[PDB]
Design a protein around this ligand. Sequence first.
Ligand SMILES: CCC1=C(C)/C(=C/C2=NC(=C\c3[nH]c(/C=C4\NC(=O)[C@H](C)[C@H]4CC)c(C)c3CCC(=O)O)/C(CCC(=O)O)=C2C)NC1=O
Ligand SMILES: CCC1=C(C)/C(=C/C2=NC(=C\c3[nH]c(/C=C4\NC(=O)[C@H](C)[C@H]4CC)c(C)c3CCC(=O)O)/C(CCC(=O)O)=C2C)NC1=O
Ligand SMILES: CCC1=C(C)/C(=C/C2=NC(=C\c3[nH]c(/C=C4\NC(=O)[C@H](C)[C@H]4CC)c(C)c3CCC(=O)O)/C(CCC(=O)O)=C2C)NC1=O
Ligand SMILES: CCC1=C(C)/C(=C/C2=NC(=C\c3[nH]c(/C=C4\NC(=O)[C@H](C)[C@H]4CC)c(C)c3CCC(=O)O)/C(CCC(=O)O)=C2C)NC1=O
Ligand SMILES: CCC1=C(C)/C(=C/C2=NC(=C\c3[nH]c(/C=C4\NC(=O)[C@H](C)[C@H]4CC)c(C)c3CCC(=O)O)/C(CCC(=O)O)=C2C)NC1=O
Ligand SMILES: CCC1=C(C)/C(=C/C2=NC(=C\c3[nH]c(/C=C4\NC(=O)[C@H](C)[C@H]4CC)c(C)c3CCC(=O)O)/C(CCC(=O)O)=C2C)NC1=O
Ligand SMILES: CCC1=C(C)/C(=C/C2=NC(=C\c3[nH]c(/C=C4\NC(=O)[C@H](C)[C@H]4CC)c(C)c3CCC(=O)O)/C(CCC(=O)O)=C2C)NC1=O
Ligand SMILES: CCC1=C(C)/C(=C/C2=NC(=C\c3[nH]c(/C=C4\NC(=O)[C@H](C)[C@H]4CC)c(C)c3CCC(=O)O)/C(CCC(=O)O)=C2C)NC1=O
Ligand SMILES: CCC1=C(C)/C(=C/C2=NC(=C\c3[nH]c(/C=C4\NC(=O)[C@H](C)[C@H]4CC)c(C)c3CCC(=O)O)/C(CCC(=O)O)=C2C)NC1=O
Ligand SMILES: CCC1=C(C)/C(=C/C2=NC(=C\c3[nH]c(/C=C4\NC(=O)[C@H](C)[C@H]4CC)c(C)c3CCC(=O)O)/C(CCC(=O)O)=C2C)NC1=O
Ligand SMILES: CCC1=C(C)/C(=C/C2=NC(=C\c3[nH]c(/C=C4\NC(=O)[C@H](C)[C@H]4CC)c(C)c3CCC(=O)O)/C(CCC(=O)O)=C2C)NC1=O
Lengths: 162, 162, 161, 289, 64, 172, 172, 172, 172
Amino acid sequence: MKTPLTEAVALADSQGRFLSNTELQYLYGRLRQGAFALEAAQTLTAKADTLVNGAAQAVYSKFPYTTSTPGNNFAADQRGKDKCARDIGYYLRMVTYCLVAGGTGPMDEYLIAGVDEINRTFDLSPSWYVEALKHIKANHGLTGDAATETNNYIDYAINALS
Amino acid sequence: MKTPLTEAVALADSQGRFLSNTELQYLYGRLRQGAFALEAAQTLTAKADTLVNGAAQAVYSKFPYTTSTPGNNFAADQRGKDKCARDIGYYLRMVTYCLVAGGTGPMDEYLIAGVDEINRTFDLSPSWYVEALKHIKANHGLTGDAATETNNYIDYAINALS
Amino acid sequence: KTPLTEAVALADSQGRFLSNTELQYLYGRLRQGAFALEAAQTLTAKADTLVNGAAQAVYSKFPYTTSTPGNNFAADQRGKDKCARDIGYYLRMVTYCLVAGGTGPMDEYLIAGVDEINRTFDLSPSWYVEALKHIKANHGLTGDAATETNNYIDYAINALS
Amino acid sequence: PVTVAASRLGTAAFDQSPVELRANYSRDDAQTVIRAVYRQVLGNDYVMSSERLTAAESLFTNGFISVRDFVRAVAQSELYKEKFLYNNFQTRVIELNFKHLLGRAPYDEAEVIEHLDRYQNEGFEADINSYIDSAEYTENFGDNIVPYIRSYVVQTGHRTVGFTRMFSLQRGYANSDRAQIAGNASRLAQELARNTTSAVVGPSGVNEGWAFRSAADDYHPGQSLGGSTGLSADDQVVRVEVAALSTPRYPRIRRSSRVFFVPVSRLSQKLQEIQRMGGRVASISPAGQ
Amino acid sequence: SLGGSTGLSADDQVVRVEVAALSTPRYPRIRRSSRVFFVPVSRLSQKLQEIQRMGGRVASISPA
Amino acid sequence: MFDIFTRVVSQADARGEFISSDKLEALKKVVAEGTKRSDAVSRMTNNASSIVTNAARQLFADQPQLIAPGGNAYTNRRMAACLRDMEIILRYVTYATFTGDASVLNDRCLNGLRETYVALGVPGASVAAGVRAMGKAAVAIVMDPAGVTSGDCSSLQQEIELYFETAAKAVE
Amino acid sequence: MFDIFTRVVSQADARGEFISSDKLEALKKVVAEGTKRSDAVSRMTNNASSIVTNAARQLFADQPQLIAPGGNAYTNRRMAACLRDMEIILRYVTYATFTGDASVLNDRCLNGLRETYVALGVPGASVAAGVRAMGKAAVAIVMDPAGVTSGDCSSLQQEIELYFETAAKAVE
Amino acid sequence: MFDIFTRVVSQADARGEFISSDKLEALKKVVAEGTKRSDAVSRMTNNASSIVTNAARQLFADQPQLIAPGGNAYTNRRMAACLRDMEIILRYVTYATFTGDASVLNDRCLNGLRETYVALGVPGASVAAGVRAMGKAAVAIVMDPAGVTSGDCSSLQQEIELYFETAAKAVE
Amino acid sequence: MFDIFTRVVSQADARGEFISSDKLEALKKVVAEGTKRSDAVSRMTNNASSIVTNAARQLFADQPQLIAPGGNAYTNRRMAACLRDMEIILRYVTYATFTGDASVLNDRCLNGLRETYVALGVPGASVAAGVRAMGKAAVAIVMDPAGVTSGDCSSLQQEIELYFETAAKAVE
Ligand SMILES: CCC1=C(C)/C(=C/C2=NC(=C\c3[nH]c(/C=C4\NC(=O)[C@H](C)[C@H]4CC)c(C)c3CCC(=O)O)/C(CCC(=O)O)=C2C)NC1=O
Ligand SMILES: CCC1=C(C)/C(=C/C2=NC(=C\c3[nH]c(/C=C4\NC(=O)[C@H](C)[C@H]4CC)c(C)c3CCC(=O)O)/C(CCC(=O)O)=C2C)NC1=O
Ligand SMILES: CCC1=C(C)/C(=C/C2=NC(=C\c3[nH]c(/C=C4\NC(=O)[C@H](C)[C@H]4CC)c(C)c3CCC(=O)O)/C(CCC(=O)O)=C2C)NC1=O
Ligand SMILES: CCC1=C(C)/C(=C/C2=NC(=C\c3[nH]c(/C=C4\NC(=O)[C@H](C)[C@H]4CC)c(C)c3CCC(=O)O)/C(CCC(=O)O)=C2C)NC1=O
Ligand SMILES: CCC1=C(C)/C(=C/C2=NC(=C\c3[nH]c(/C=C4\NC(=O)[C@H](C)[C@H]4CC)c(C)c3CCC(=O)O)/C(CCC(=O)O)=C2C)NC1=O
Ligand SMILES: CCC1=C(C)/C(=C/C2=NC(=C\c3[nH]c(/C=C4\NC(=O)[C@H](C)[C@H]4CC)c(C)c3CCC(=O)O)/C(CCC(=O)O)=C2C)NC1=O
Ligand SMILES: CCC1=C(C)/C(=C/C2=NC(=C\c3[nH]c(/C=C4\NC(=O)[C@H](C)[C@H]4CC)c(C)c3CCC(=O)O)/C(CCC(=O)O)=C2C)NC1=O
Ligand SMILES: CCC1=C(C)/C(=C/C2=NC(=C\c3[nH]c(/C=C4\NC(=O)[C@H](C)[C@H]4CC)c(C)c3CCC(=O)O)/C(CCC(=O)O)=C2C)NC1=O
Ligand SMILES: CCC1=C(C)/C(=C/C2=NC(=C\c3[nH]c(/C=C4\NC(=O)[C@H](C)[C@H]4CC)c(C)c3CCC(=O)O)/C(CCC(=O)O)=C2C)NC1=O
Ligand SMILES: CCC1=C(C)/C(=C/C2=NC(=C\c3[nH]c(/C=C4\NC(=O)[C@H](C)[C@H]4CC)c(C)c3CCC(=O)O)/C(CCC(=O)O)=C2C)NC1=O
Ligand SMILES: CCC1=C(C)/C(=C/C2=NC(=C\c3[nH]c(/C=C4\NC(=O)[C@H](C)[C@H]4CC)c(C)c3CCC(=O)O)/C(CCC(=O)O)=C2C)NC1=O
């Protein structure tokens, strides 16, 4: 729940003080981020289906063996392909929430808390979703402050993922 | 760490009592385990080179892609094969120590503490060592109480590994 | 103090599943019980003669508790009844301690506050010490069961004094 | 620091300033702080000398080992596991560790995940270490002071909740923490995940309705839906809780302790009816409107 | 460090951190600035983070 | 904890779909008026302590039984406790209007305000009237501009009015 | 916590006026008999532990089901717990008659005595009869003078009798 | 906490007499089959984690609303919480069949399983069906011998079946 | 902490090779005499407290300056502290001969025995002589068989003699 307004509130709660001017600057920074983050989330939501479709196909061409061998993590038949594409769509939707929230909190709470543990107990590999996010950050094709703020969120997910 | 004599000592330390008869029974059970565990460790040390060699070759045939693609975890060239065979030899040596110590303590301290974390940061897969230990527990070919005590240690490493 | 339950408490504190150490612990408990049950059987057969000889031996061991009128001592017959009740309680705790595989029935039911009630009632633990000495001299058993019971008895003696 | 009906809430016994271990304490002052540590961490449970752990205690009496590490030592001990970890539920064990070490009631569901998650991941030995190695721990009493209940003071950082959840946790002064009305069950774990608080009750005799406990099946919320639209009375409504209903008997009364919701206009008549049943009133709190 | 690991109740070795120059760190309101503590490696990271967060400079660390 | 952005996120995650465009237009309106959130929070945090004293002033001019001996606000310790209660109540109002969501004030005051006030014997009527007068004074200092560039502020007025009525029906 | 002087202070502060003269005459009577408070507290604290053993003696001669196995006072640990309960009960009686106000005994025993005794399964009847017999023995050792200068002590007799009946209806 | 030996001890102490001979013959039968307790506990602790994944497999093939967004087991954090719940449930089953008494599982799960599951909003139906399927798979891996010396195991089958039905009617 | 098995494991891990066959034959000898470790530990733990009193007996017959006022063992509190020191010293000797390695006794007594004894003012000479006499009495009760089946025990005699001399040069 990493939200700079709420993190400022949690800070001033821990201090027990009233609202300081540091928090006013914090609000200014949040507005400065949101003033392009909302439009970036808009075009991401426009592009999202082509993004997850190209990302799934690129990961399938990236490792041929997950299509090849019959296994439980891998997409041998079409149900595994559905679960795989559901997972990358989940990832990109977390990216959009992470962008629109102004912080890593939706990402943190909804993915980062136990991702490596379910990857351990299901024998998944995080590198699949790493190269998926690499294809997404190559595919969104944006420019400006919004593009690199989204790219920052994406490589944060990559770093915490690996 | 995990030796039934030392666990009994740690228990009686926490109670602050003298040696009770429960600890005498604990010592009896440890002697009962060791009376075949030592001979089992002997024949394991006799078989160890063929075990790790067949286990490495079986994992290489188990997944052809680690031989195939050039990568940093995978054994593309021969140095990765050396590191891979070093890892399975490390595993089997931990199994022998785990057997001769009477408990899971050498395994716990020397492998189980951070194995999934280095697998995460190096992008290894634990399932490789899982199927390696499956080949070892298929290959040792022993019978009796010692065989299943070793098999218990091996599947403990498998369960904690995955 | 039960080695199965102590193993469970250990694995609870570790938070692990059942290890093979606990399997060996169970093996040791079965090895103890395989004579402990028969020893508890012959103790229960002998118990009345044991407590009767132990009470008479403690009465001959110190003549003054029969002699002087006091509240701890057995001047009249009610104190003799309470005294024999106490040694019968002791031997029954010994049998439970044997059949449980550990000192837990002894610990919970005697050892927790025995010296405190001996302090506030002005009893002497040495009476029950020499009583347990007479019991461990009187049971007359041999083998692993005999010395396991003797170990429990001198544990009660050591914690008693 | 209450000082109005402090008798009624039972927190009058916890009035005193905390105990502080000096730089060169005497042997008797050591024993007082040891008795305070035993009483607070085991929750006014008295200790036998066989379970006294005199060996770990002597190291503290030297001064080589701090008071906070002695608190760690008694919580690392097997007797604390046998009294509290073993009989109680593990969520209830987390609840007890909040009173025993931090000195306050838990505030939300996030702390009970963090300690359950930690229990499965690393053990009770590590969980206790996480309670004591805390900023919330070290602020209120760093090394020298005993743990003590801080929930009655705001302390710049209490949520409201812990004040009232503490009275579900502890009763009185005489009450030993192993031994409560509910026994094995955990009071607060129902309250946490719904994010709700029950009404504050004081301990017995001073209050005679102490017997009332909310049923686990029936929540009975405080507000009762609309300032009594459905009860059809113009005045505001108060919650009323009765402790026993024993005069009425078995075929008339299925359960002794129940919650009524009344307007104030009919309050007097229902209170008279309760007294006619010989029932004594636990709590009465304003409900709605 | 007497007892080695008994009163600390963690089997791992003891590091014996000595800290100096502690001045209004938090609410504990400690009587002197420089103190010597005994920590094991199992909780050495937590106490070291606490020592630095308080405002203290560790002056010596010597395994006992 | 919950911000209005995180409110929209939690709605869109409970539905589990992407966020609607019109909701994003509402958020564009929100970030357009974030400077007015800053204006209001700065204005009333500038005058907050004097607002607390004036609220206690009207309360103690209104109900002299509190100052009267045997009253609940009679003693010096309890008087400081009163001013503590009002100050932290106004503090959580400032938290809520800074965040934009009442969840902070609700989740950190609604739970045990009524509970402490019935358990101690605190008359909830005086705190309700006091937080009402404090809210009126807060709207009075927020709305009027003193050398401030002009604009409409009716939505903010509605927001802090709602926050103070949630406080008032919290304590009752 | 509350002494009879502080009782008078709390009454005079709840009224908020100065203390009446006749109440001060009552306090003059109290400080005139403070040496008899000292006489009584010293006398029964001299014999307190033997009083506890004699109370347990009459209780265990009366109800042999407690000593009987399965009884609540059967085990050695529970027997020491019994003597602990009676000793600290007599200790708080001595606290109350030293202070002169029953508030210490009430506020540190009335709250959870009944509560622990119904929660554990402790029969409150035996503790009530035991504290009654202990109170009779306490009056017996307090009232009779042994080499003590003579005087009237009926008010003190009434006081500790009231303290023991508050204990008896505390545990019930 | 309570073992079947300590169960017999607690019965014989509540009666307060020595243990009957036929009960000691039953305990002789118990120590005769203690190696089969070892056989079963070792067998199912060998395969325990794969049993947990297969139970979650059948549960998530059965009820796709849990994986569906807005479901209780939907999120990654809650999914790990699910596997945590099932793993510690099977862990306490292994504790109970190692001890031989259901008191460990009852006293450390029966108390707050239903409580947490109604307080969180967890559907107890899915956990009940999952622990039933997990118990069927556990009997399936325990009973069939793979290179194990032959014997009868019907009493153990009854025992773990009873343990899993106590878990199932614990969560409901 | 360190057992002789774990000693062999730590040597074989520091070398990083598999264990030698002759060392495994030594361990076969060790598990062959583990019943004699049990015999000795049981024998001296049977008589341990009386051994402590007899050691204090010879110490206090030897050095009457300790009982003499101003002596270090003079006071009742310090006398109980003395018996505490000797009892826990014999306890760690029993720990070491049960484990078979002196590492437990070293790592939990060698560190601060000398340190406490020079810091308090405790004469280390008396503790050294007392642990020597206690070790002689311990060998005396261990070695002689009373109704015990006969065997050689010279290695155990050497082992506890080494343990008591490590204690003696620990305190000095
Ligand atoms: C909001 C964030 C979020 C994510 C990302 C998430 C992922 C997630 N993926 C899962 C499984 C899975 N994930 C895969 C995925 C793959 N195998 C392949 O071929 C591909 C390489 C890869 C596609 C990414 C498969 C095949 C399963 C089922 C494993 C099996 O069938 O046993 C599971 C276990 C439950 C289940 O589907 O059956 C979770 C919880 N959950 C979340 O809450
Ligand atoms: C005593 C127990 C113990 C174990 C098991 C252990 C394993 C271990 N394996 C490692 C790396 C590695 N492990 C592998 C292994 C593989 N890639 C493959 O082709 C095979 C499938 C697999 C053989 C198992 C490779 C290739 C590396 C180096 C990763 C890379 O080169 O960047 C590393 C990182 C340091 C390094 O070698 O360069 C550790 C610590 N360490 C221990 O202390
Ligand atoms: C299950 C274990 C267990 C034991 C052993 C036990 C002993 C026990 N013995 C007691 C008293 C007593 N014990 C004695 C005993 C003696 N005086 C003598 O002449 C003999 C030397 C000695 C016989 C051992 C006497 C005389 C009393 C009553 C003290 C008195 O009458 O005031 C009491 C005080 C209550 C009472 O009887 O009246 C307890 C609790 N309780 C237990 O729960
Ligand atoms: C962060 C959220 C939060 C809030 C709001 C909070 C309130 C709170 N108000 C309290 C007391 C109080 N509140 C009042 C209030 C009043 N005086 C009156 O008579 C009027 C009706 C009203 C004047 C404003 C008084 C007098 C006390 C002291 C009560 C006592 O002494 O028992 C107490 C009792 C502790 C103390 O003595 O300071 C708490 C915990 N605690 C929290 O954690
Ligand atoms: C300072 C005020 C204060 C009081 C008074 C107090 C009493 C108190 N009495 C207790 C137990 C007890 N009280 C008794 C009492 C009796 N035995 C009987 O059968 C008779 C009916 C009665 C004899 C006098 C017994 C047997 C226990 C132990 C109950 C148990 O083992 O569960 C316990 C349970 C803790 C323990 O095991 O020691 C507490 C907390 N605690 C306090 O903090
Ligand atoms: C804390 C230090 C600090 C302050 C004060 C700050 C104020 C601030 N208030 C502003 C706008 C504004 N602020 C207001 C707010 C108000 N005007 C009214 O008439 C109402 C009385 C009041 C609302 C309660 C309005 C109406 C605007 C301009 C149009 C708009 O954005 O609504 C702006 C935008 C441009 C400008 O007018 O300067 C700034 C920078 N920024 C800061 O960093
Ligand atoms: C603790 C060490 C200590 C003691 C004992 C002490 C006693 C004490 N009791 C006294 C008076 C007295 N004390 C009593 C009390 C009693 N007389 C009775 O007949 C009743 C049996 C009993 C009341 C239970 C009476 C009647 C007087 C004298 C007149 C009066 O003050 O009431 C006095 C006043 C002058 C005197 O008589 O010596 C002293 C000093 N002071 C101390 O420092
Ligand atoms: C030692 C005994 C013990 C048990 C058994 C125990 C259970 C327990 N299960 C919990 C949660 C949970 N349990 C589930 C269960 C499920 N998911 C579903 O939807 C299905 C119906 C079921 C799948 C198996 C879920 C999703 C949570 C997380 C609930 C939440 O996030 O609020 C929680 C809340 C804390 C957390 O977030 O981890 C506890 C305390 N705690 C204990 O101390
Ligand atoms: C953990 C390391 C370890 C293991 C495995 C162990 C096993 C073990 N299982 C045994 C007996 C046995 N175990 C079984 C149990 C079974 N047989 C079946 O057909 C069922 C499928 C299964 C019960 C679920 C039976 C039937 C016997 C022999 C007769 C009996 O005791 O009932 C015995 C007695 C002699 C023998 O057969 O070797 C041992 C030592 N001891 C150990 O230390
Ligand atoms: C687990 C390992 C361990 C050991 C061995 C240990 C010993 C230890 N012995 C101590 C004291 C003592 N040891 C003695 C010893 C003696 N009296 C004499 O004069 C003789 C020379 C010798 C008789 C045997 C005395 C008198 C004290 C009390 C010293 C004092 O009062 O300052 C103290 C001081 C604390 C106390 O007052 O009890 C410690 C910590 N602590 C440990 O943690
Ligand atoms: C604690 C309850 C308990 C006891 C006592 C126990 C004793 C025990 N001591 C034994 C052997 C033995 N124990 C000894 C030891 C000794 N003999 C001597 O002459 C020396 C005086 C002494 C060594 C200090 C010897 C010499 C043997 C037989 C041959 C050998 O193993 O060395 C054996 C093997 C077979 C037998 O002789 O019964 C047992 C079972 N087991 C138990 O569970």
